[PDB]
Design a protein around this ligand. Structure first.
Ligand SMILES: [Zn+2]
Length: 87
């Protein structure tokens, strides 16, 4: 079993459990300045579904689910999603 760690501005703000038979939902990160990234968890996988950064690189990256995968990164918003083991 794995977990996704969402970090923004060097603060870990949310840890999502990645369960194969798990729920499907969205979580919105939105800063006071209007910068936002919409996280979508679908069972055991996670992505940024939508964002308003200038290049949408994190959106275009799509889903990750395994610890070794390159983290989802929105560099303009200083936001990162990495997958890791339940330790
Ligand atoms: Zn981005």
């Amino acid at each position: 079993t794995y977990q996704a760690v969402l970090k923004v501005d060097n603060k870990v703000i949310k840890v999502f459990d990645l369960k194969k038979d798990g729920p499907h939902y969205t979580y919105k990160y939105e800063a006071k300045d209007g910068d936002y990234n919409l996280i979508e968890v679908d069972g055991d996988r996670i992505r940024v579904k939508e964002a308003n950064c200038a290049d949408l690189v994190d959106v275009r990256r799509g889903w990750i689910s395994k610890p070794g995968e390159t983290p989802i990164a929105c560099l303009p918003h200083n936001l990162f999603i990495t997958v890791e083991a339940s330790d």
